[PDB]
C-alpha cells in the first residue's frame, strides 16, 4: 500500500499516477530523458508516511542528479519540477492568482511596497496581468531556479516560505521602474520591458532583481571613493565605506594621494590602508563574509615596494593587508623605462606639485614634471631598476591572482570625460568601472563626489540580430535611469555623483556562446571583425537611446564635463593600433549621432561597461560575461545536492566552443578585449590566463607575463582584472 | 589454508577431492549402515560442486587428529569481579584456538558508583585477553564489545578506538556494538534528551531493555523523574551524531537494534533473550554470565556456520536436498568437537544453534537481471529467502523426528507455534508483495509437535576465503570491481567475478549504487526469514556529496531506513576514497 502524510495532517494512499502525470507534463518537448529512471531513483527512497513535500524534493533532486553533458535536458526536467513545487508552496496550486489579488495580499502582508497600489489602478493591474505569460517559468534551467529560490524571489528569512513566482517578479520590477511615465506610454513600456527580461534579453543585477517591488530602497552596489591627503578625509572616506558596506556594496578606494612613510602619514600609508580594510569588513560574519574592496595607487608611490606585497601570505602582520585587492596604476612613461631597461624614480605625492594630477590628465605635463623632479636634489626620492619593480608586481599578480592593473593614460585619452575638468583617477572592485571622483572632508561634505554606477547587460545569446538591440537599449537605458531617481543616497557626495552624471554601465553576457553560434574563436583572430561589428551596434544604440531620452527629459546636469559635449566620440579616440587588427567598416551613421548628441545631449555620461557575471548568467543559462567557460559543465556546492549547468546548446556546439584552457595563449582574447574598448565608455573586466603545463618544467616565465602586459597596453586595454593559473 | 600439509618442510599431502570425501566421511560416520555411505556420497557431491560452503576450521581440520572447530563465541559479563575474571579466562581459552568473540560488558557499573573505577579499565583487560595469542599484539584474536546507548559512560565509550586522545581512555584494538531501541530513536525524531543511567542504579531497566519495550517505557520515564538516582541528560541529536561521526571515522562502530532482536526471534525473551551479537553482527543468541570459568550455571553461546552458493543451484527446490545435507553435517559436528569451557558446551548441547548463510547473491541477482539499488530485486529476494528458511526448517524438523528435538527447544517461539512469518517488521508489507509459496501452516504444526533439532538455522555472514574457493561474490555484498587483487609471495592473485564476459552490464558494482536504500530494503526482506541477523554494510562515496563531504543528515536518515524495515544490525561502514 504505502500511506502519505499530506500538508493538513491525515494520510491517504500514495498517488503514483498523479506523480507520473506531473513527471510527464514536465518532460514536454525535452529529448533524451527517461521518466522511469527518475521514478526508479526517487521511489526507492519513499517511506510509509513520508510527506508530500518530501516526495517532491526527492523527485526533483533525482531529476537534478541525472544532468550530464550527454543528457543535458534533465536541466529542464528538474527545473519544471522545482517550478511546480514552488507554485504549490506559494499559491497552494499551479495556476497563479490574479495579479491584483496577489499584490493586495502582498502589501497587507507588508512584503510588497504600498506605492504599487497608489501608482496603478485595479484596471491597470488587470491589464498588466494580460502581459504575463506564466509559462515562461518553464524555460528556466535548474541552476536558474535554485538561484531564483535563493536570491531573487520574495520570501521568508526565518520560516523559509516563498511568496511569489518569477513572472510576478519580472512584471513588478517593470511596473516599479516605469511607474512615473505618462498614461499614454507607461503600460506599453511595462509590457515591452517585462518581455525583454522574461525572455532573457536584458539581465538585471541582484539587488534590483531582489528588491524592486519591496519596501526597501537600497540598490547601489558599486561605489568609488577617493581619499585626500588629510586626517579629515581618511575619516570621511572610512565613514562612507562603513555606510555603504552595511548595504552590501563593493568599493573602489583610491588612497594613492596619502603621503609616504616619514614625510614632514608621517607614519605612512599602510596603517591607513588597514583602517580602510576594517571599515570594509565592518559588516561581515567572522571578518571575511561580505564587504569587498579594491584599493588603488600609482606605481611611482614611494612605498610601492611595501604596497606590492600587502596581501602576501608570508611576512609580518604590521606590513600585511590581505583582505583587499589592489590596482597598480601605470602609464606610458613607466613602460618606456621598462623597454629601455632604465630606472623608475619613486616620489611621495606630497613632495611633487602637480605630478599626481598630470599623471591622470596630461601625459606631456607628466614627462616634463617627472624628469624635472628627478633632476632636483632637494626632493626626497628613490630609484630602482624598472625590470625589478615590474617583476615584483607581476610575481605578486601571479601569486595571488588579485593584483590588478589600471592604465591611467588610456582612461583619460579614451573616455567620455574631459580630464582637465573631470579626470578618471581610479576604478572599482572589478576594474570595469571608470568614473570621476572628488575627495570629501567630512562624511556629509557637499563639495565631495563619490561615484556610483547602475549596471545591466544584454544577452548576446538571446538576440536574433544586431538591430534587435535598438529596442533593448531603449528599454535598458530607461529602466536604469528611472532607478536613479528611485534609490536612496546615504552620503550626499554619492548623490551628487549620481544626480550630476547619471552614469550607467551596461555590459554583455553570453559572448562565448555567441562566438560559437557564429563559428568563431577567441584565440586565433577569427572573431575580431564580428566583435567589432557587435560592439559598434552596442555603443551606437546605447547612445541613440540616451540621446532620445535627453530630448524627452533633459540631458544630465554635468553633461558639459564630457567629451561628448564637445563632439568627440569614442570612434575618434581609440588606440590607433587597433587599425592593424580589424578592418570592419562602421555600419551606423556616427556623424548624424555626433551632431545629435552635441545639440540635445546625453541623459547618462556613460552607458557601457563590461562586467563579470555569475548569478545573472545562471538565470539565463549563458556563458559568463565575455569569458570562455573552463569546461562544459559547472558544479556548484549546495545543501540541496550538487548543482550542474551545462553550457547552452552543448549537443550542437561542443566543437564550436573554445574552452578557457584550450587557448594557446592570451593574444586573441586581448585583441578581442581591445576591440571592445574601442566602443566601451568605461572599462572591461579583462582576465589573463596561464596553464603551467604549457611551459618548460611546468613554470610560467616572467617573459611571457610582461610580453602580455604590453600586448594589452598596445591594443589600448585599460584594465587587467584576475590572473587565473590552472593547477596542472 | 585447506589441504593437509607440512608447517615446516612445506610438503603437501592431499588433493581437494580427498579433502571433500574425508570431511564427508567424518561428519557422517555415526549414521547407520543403511544410510551412511549414501549421505557421504550425497554430501561429497554438494561440496565438490560448490553448492554448500564450509568454514575454514572445518575444511582445514575435519579428518585430522584435532577437535577444535568452534570459531564463533559469545560471552556475557556480569557486574562483579568474579565474572570479569571468568569472562577474561574464557576469552583466553578460546582465542588460543583462533576464535572471534562477542563480549557484552554492558552490565558493568559506571565510573564512581557506590567499576568504582569504571568500565574502561575492564574493557582494556578484555582487549589483552583477546590479543593474548597474537604475533606482535594485532595478529589474530578478534572481538566486538557491546553496550547500551544509555550507559552512563557512553560518551567515553563511543570514542575508545579514536586515533587522537590520551592512552587511559583508548581501547583501539576491539570493535563495539552500540545497542539501540525505539525509545532512543523517538528522542531523536522529537529532538529531546536521552537520560543516561548506570545499570547498577536502575532495577530491571537493563532486562526490560532487551525483553519488554513497554516495561522499558514505564521504567525509563519513572527513573528519569526520580531525584535520588544518579543520572545524566544530553540532547539526543548530540549522542547520535557522536556515534555516527565515530562509525564514519573508523568504519567499525556497529549498531544492534535490540528490540527487533527480541520481537523477531526464534527465542522467547522472557526465558532466553538475545542481548548481544558476535564479532560480525550476524549472530544473535542467548547467554548467561558465568562466575568462574568452570561455572556450570553459565551459558556462553557458540554457532556453527555454513552457506549455500546461490550461483550453483539451478532452481530453488534444489535447496531441499542441500538443507538436509547442510543441517545434518553441522549437527554431527556439534557432538564431534571439543568444549574448553563447560558454559560453552551447555549452550551448544542445549540449543544446538546453526547459522547457514548465502554466498553469490550479487551474481545470482545479475543472472536474473536484477539490481540492488532500484527495488527490481525485492520480490526475487523474498521468494529466495522463503525457499531458504523453509527448507532449513523442514530439514531440522525431519532431523528432530529421527533423533530428538534439542533439549531447550521449549525456550523458543517455535515451540509455541510462532514462526518468523508471524513476527517480521510489518513495514516490509509496503516494499514487496511476493506471496508465500510453501505451506507454512503444515510446517507450523509439524514443528510444534516434533520440534526442531537446532534452535536457529539461518544467519547471513560475511565471506572471503570460502567465496574464493568457488569463485563467488562475497556473501550478499556487491563487488567493489570486476577484478580482485590479492598480495601474495607468489605474485599478484587476480579473480574475475563469475561469468563476467556475459554479465558485466548485469552487475551493479558497489560504488555504482546511487545510495543505501535498495540494499537496506533487500537486507530487511532477508530479515523477514533469517533466524539471527545479517552482516549488513552501509556505503558512502564522498564525491557524490557537495564539497566531497558526507552529511550527518544522510547518515541518520539511513540509520532510520534500516530500523524501519526491521534490520537488526549494521556492520561496517565503507567510505570510498575519492
Amino acid at each position: 500500500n504505502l500511506l502519505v502524510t499530506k500538508r493538513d495532517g491525515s494520510t491517504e494512499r500514495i498517488n503514483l499516477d498523479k506523480i507520473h502525470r506531473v513527471l510527464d507534463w514536465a518532460a514536454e518537448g525535452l529529448h533524451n530523458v527517461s521518466i522511469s529512471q527518475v521514478e526508479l531513483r526517487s521511489h526507492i527512497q519513499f517511506y510509509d508516511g513520508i510527506k508530500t513535500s518530501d516526495i517532491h524534493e526527492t523527485i526533483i533532486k533525482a531529476a537534478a542528479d541525472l544532468i550530464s553533458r550527454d543528457a543535458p535536458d534533465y536541466q529542464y526536467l528538474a527545473a519544471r519540477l522545482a517550478i511546480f513545487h514552488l507554485r504549490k508552496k506559494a499559491y497552494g496550486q499551479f495556476e497563479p492568482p490574479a495579479l491584483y489579488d496577489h499584490v493586495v495580499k502582498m502589501v497587507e502582508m507588508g512584503k510588497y511596497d504600498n506605492h504599487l497600489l497608489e501608482d496603478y489602478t485595479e484596471e491597470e493591474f488587470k491589464q498588466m496581468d494580460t502581459f504575463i505569460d506564466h509559462d515562461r517559468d518553464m524555460t528556466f534551467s535548474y541552476a536558474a531556479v535554485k538561484q531564483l529560490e535563493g536570491k531573487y524571489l520574495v520570501q521568508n528569512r526565518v520560516t523559509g516560505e516563498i511568496y511569489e513566482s518569477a513572472q510576478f517578479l519580472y512584471i513588478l520590477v517593470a511596473a516599479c521602474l516605469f511607474s512615473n511615465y505618462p498614461r499614454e506610454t507607461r503600460l506599453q513600456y511595462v509590457k515591452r520591458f517585462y518581455d525583454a527580461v522574461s525572455t532573457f534579453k536584458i539581465s538585471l543585477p541582484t539587488p534590483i532583481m531582489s528588491g524592486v517591488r519591496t519596501p526597501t530602497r537600497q540598490f547601489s552596489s558599486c561605489v568609488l571613493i577617493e581619499c585626500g591627503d588629510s586626517l579629515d578625509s581618511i575619516n570621511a572616506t572610512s565613514s562612507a565605506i562603513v555606510k555603504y558596506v552595511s548595504q552590501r556594496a563593493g568599493i573602489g578606494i583610491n588612497a594613492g594621494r596619502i603621503r609616504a612613510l616619514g614625510s614632514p602619514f608621517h607614519t605612512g600609508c599602510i596603517p591607513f590602508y588597514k583602517h580602510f580594510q576594517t571599515a570594509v569588513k565592518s559588516c561581515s560574519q567572522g571578518g571575511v563574509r561580505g564587504g569587498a574592496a579594491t584599493l588603488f595607487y600609482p606605481m611611482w608611490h614611494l612605498e610601492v615596494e611595501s604596497l606590492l606585497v600587502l596581501k602576501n601570505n608570508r611576512g609580518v602582520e604590521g606590513n600585511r593587508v590581505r583582505h583587499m585587492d589592489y590596482g597598480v596604476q601605470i602609464n606610458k612613461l613607466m613602460y618606456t623605462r621598462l623597454l629601455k631597461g632604465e630606472d623608475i624614480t619613486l616620489f611621495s605625492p606630497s613632495d611633487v606639485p602637480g605630478l599626481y594630477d598630470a599623471f591622470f590628465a596630461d601625459q606631456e605635463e607628466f614627462e616634463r614634471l617627472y624628469t624635472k623632479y628627478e633632476k632636483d636634489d632637494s626632493i626626497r626620492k628613490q630609484r630602482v631598476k624598472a625590470v625589478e619593480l615590474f617583476s615584483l608586481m607581476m610575481q605578486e599578480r601571479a601569486s595571488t591572482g588579485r593584483i590588478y592593473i589600471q592604465n591611467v593614460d588610456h582612461c583619460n585619452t579614451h573616455s567620455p570625460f574631459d580630464p582637465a575638468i573631470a579626470p578618471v583617477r581610479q576604478s572599482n572592485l572589478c576594474l570595469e568601472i571608470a568614473l570621476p571622483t572628488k575627495p570629501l572632508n567630512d562624511v556629509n561634505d557637499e563639495n565631495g563626489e563619490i561615484a556610483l554606477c547602475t549596471l545591466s547587460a544584454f544577452n548576446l545569446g538571446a538576440i536574433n540580430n544586431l538591430d534587435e538591440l535598438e529596442e533593448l537599449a531603449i528599454l535598458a537605458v530607461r529602466a536604469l535611469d528611472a532607478l536613479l531617481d528611485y534609490q536612496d543616497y546615504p552620503i550626499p557626495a554619492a548623490k551628487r555623483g549620481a544626480m550630476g552624471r547619471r552614469t550607467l554601465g551596461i555590459g554583455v553576457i553570453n559572448f562565448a556562446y555567441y562566438l560559437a553560434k557564429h563559428g568563431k574563436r577567441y584565440s586565433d583572430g577569427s572573431a575580431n571583425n564580428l566583435t567589432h561589428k557587435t560592439f559598434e551596434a552596442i555603443q551606437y544604440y546605447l547612445l541613440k537611446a540616451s540621446n532620445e531620452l535627453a530630448k524627452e527629459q533633459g540631458a544630465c546636469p554635468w553633461f558639459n564635463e564630457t567629451t561628448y559635449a564637445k563632439g568627440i566620440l569614442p570612434i575618434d579616440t581609440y588606440k590607433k593600433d587597433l587599425d592593424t587588427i580589424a578592418n570592419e567598416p562602421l555600419h551606423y551613421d556616427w556623424e548624424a549621432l555626433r551632431e545629435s548628441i552635441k545639440t540635445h545631449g546625453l541623459r547618462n555620461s556613460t552607458l557601457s561597461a563590461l562586467m563579470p557575471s555569475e548569478t545573472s548568467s545562471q538565470i539565463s543559462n549563458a556563458t559568463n560575461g565575455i569569458e570562455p567557460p573552463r569546461g562544459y559543465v559547472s558544479i556548484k556546492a549546495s545543501k540541496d545536492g550538487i548543482l550542474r549547468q551545462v553550457v547552452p546548446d552543448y549537443e550542437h556546439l561542443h566543437d564550436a566552443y573554445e574552452l578557457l584552457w584550450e587557448m594557446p595563449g592570451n593574444d586573441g582574447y586581448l585583441q578581442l578585449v581591445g576591440i571592445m574598448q574601442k566602443f566601451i565608455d568605461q572599462s572591461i573586466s579583462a582576465n589573463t590566463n596561464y596553464d603551467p603545463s604549457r611551459f618548460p618544467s611546468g613554470k610560467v616565465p616572467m617573459q611571457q607575463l610582461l610580453k602580455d602586459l604590453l600586448t594589452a597596453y598596445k591594443f589600448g586595454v585599460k584594465t587587467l582584472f584576475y590572473q587565473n593559473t590552472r593547477d596542472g | 589454508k585447506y589441504l593437509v600439509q607440512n608447517r615446516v618442510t612445506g610438503e603437501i599431502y592431499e588433493s581437494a577431492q580427498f579433502l571433500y570425501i574425508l570431511v564427508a566421511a567424518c561428519l557422517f560416520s555415526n549414521y547407520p549402515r543403511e544410510t551412511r555411505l549414501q549421505y557421504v556420497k550425497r554430501f561429497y557431491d554438494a561440496v565438490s560442486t560448490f553448492k554448500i560452503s564450509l568454514p575454514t576450521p572445518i575444511m582445514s581440520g575435519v579428518r585430522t587428529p584435532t577437535r577444535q572447530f568452534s570459531s564463533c563465541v559469545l560471552i556475557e559479563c556480569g557486574d562483579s569481579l568474579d565474572s570479569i575474571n571468568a569472562t577474561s579466562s574464557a576469552i583466553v581459552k578460546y582465542v588460543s584456538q583462533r576464535a572471534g568473540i562477542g563480549i557484552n560488558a554492558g552490565r558493568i557499573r559506571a565510573l564512581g558508583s557506590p567499576f568504582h573505577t569504571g568500565c574502561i579499565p575492564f574493557y582494556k583487560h578484555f582487549q589483552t585477553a583477546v590479543k593474548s595469542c597474537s604475533q606482535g599484539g594485532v595478529r589474530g584474536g578478534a572481538a566486538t564489545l557491546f553496550y547500551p546507548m544509555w550507559h552512563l559512560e557512553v560518551e567515553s565509550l563511543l570514542v575508545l578506538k579514536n586515533n587522537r586522545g590520551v592512552e587511559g581512555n583508548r581501547v583501539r584494538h576491539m570493535d563495539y556494538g552500540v545497542q539501540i531501541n525505539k525509545l532512543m530513536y523517538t528522542r531523536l525524531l522529537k529532538g529531546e534528551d536521552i537520560t543516561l543511567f548506570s545499570p547498577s542504579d536502575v532495577p530491571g531497566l537493563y532486562d526490560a531493555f532487551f525483553a519488554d519495550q513497554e516495561e522499558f517505557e514505564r521504567l525509563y520515564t519513572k527513573y528519569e523523574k526520580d531525584d535520588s538516582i544518579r543520572k545524566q541528560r544530553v540532547k539526543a541529536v548530540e549522542l547520535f551524531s557522536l556515534m555516527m561521526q565515530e562509525r564514519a571515522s573508523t568504519g567499525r562502530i556497529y549498531i544492534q537494534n535490540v528490540d527487533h532482536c527480541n520481537t523477531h526471534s526464534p527465542f522467547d525473551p522472557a526465558i532466553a533473550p538475545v542481548r548481544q551479537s558476535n564479532l560480525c553482527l550476524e549472530i544473535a543468541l542467548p547467554t548467561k554470565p558465568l562466575n568462574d570459568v568452570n561455572d556450570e550455571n553459565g551459558e556462553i553461546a557458540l554457532c556453527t556456520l555454513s552457506a549455500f552458493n546461490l550461483g550453483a543451484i539451478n532452481n530453488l527446490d534444489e535447496l531441499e536436498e542441500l538443507a538436509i545435507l547442510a543441517v545434518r553435517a553441522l549437527d554431527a559436528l556439534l557432538d564431534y568437537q571439543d568444549y574448553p569451557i563447560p558454559a560453552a558446551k551447555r549452550g551448544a548441547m542445549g540449543r544446538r544453534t546453526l547459522g547457514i548463510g548465502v554466498i553469490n547473491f550479487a551474481y545470482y541477482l545479475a543472472k536474473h537481471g536484477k539490481r540492488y539499488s532500484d527495488g527490481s530485486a525485492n520480490n526475487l529476494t523474498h521468494k529466495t529467502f522463503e525457499a531458504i528458511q523453509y527448507y532449513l526448517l523442514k530439514a531440522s524438523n525431519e532431523l528432530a523426528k529421527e533423533q530428538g528435538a534439542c533439549p531447550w527447544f521449549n525456550e523458543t517461539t517455535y515451540a509455541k507455534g510462532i514462526l518468523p512469518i508471524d513476527t517480521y517488521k510489518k513495514d516490509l508489507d509496503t516494499i514487496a508483495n511476493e506471496p508465500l509459496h510453501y505451506d507454512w501452516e503444515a510446517l507450523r504444526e509439524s514443528i510444534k509437535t516434533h520440534g526442531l533439532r537446532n534452535s536457529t538455522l539461518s544467519a547471513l555472514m560475511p565471506s572471503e576465503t570460502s567465496s574464493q574457493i568457488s569463485n563467488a561474490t562475497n556473501g550478499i555484498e556487491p563487488p567493489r570491481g570486476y577484478v580482485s587483487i590479492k598480495a601474495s609471495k607468489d605474485g599478484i592473485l587476480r579473480q574475475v567475478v563469475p561469468d563476467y564476459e556475459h554479465l558485466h552490464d548485469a552487475y551493479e558494482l558497489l560504488w555504482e549504487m546511487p545510495g543505501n536504500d535498495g540494499y537496506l530494503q533487500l537486507v530487511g526482506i532477508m530479515q523477514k526469514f533469517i533466524d539471527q541477523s545479517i552482516s549488513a554494510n552501509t556505503n558512502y562515496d564522498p564525491s557524490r556529496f557537495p564539497s566531497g563531504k558526507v552529511p550527518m543528515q544522510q547518515l541518520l536518515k539511513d540509520l532510520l531506513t534500516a530500523y524501519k524495515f526491521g534490520v537488526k544490525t549494521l556492520f561496517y561502514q565503507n567510505t570510498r576514497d575519492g
Binding site: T5, Y47, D48, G49, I50, K51, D54 | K182, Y185, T186, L188, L189, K190, G191, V237, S241, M244, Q245, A248, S249, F545, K549, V550, P551, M552, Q553, L555, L556, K557, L560, Y563, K564
Partner: peptide, 16 residues
C-alpha cells in the same frame, strides 16, 4: 568527512 548540521524538523517526519 562529515557535515555536522542536523535538521530535526526534517527528521520529525519519519515514522519508525
Amino acid at each position: 568527512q562529515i557535515d555536522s548540521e542536523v535538521d530535526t524538523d526534517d527528521l520529525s517526519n519519519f515514522q519508525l
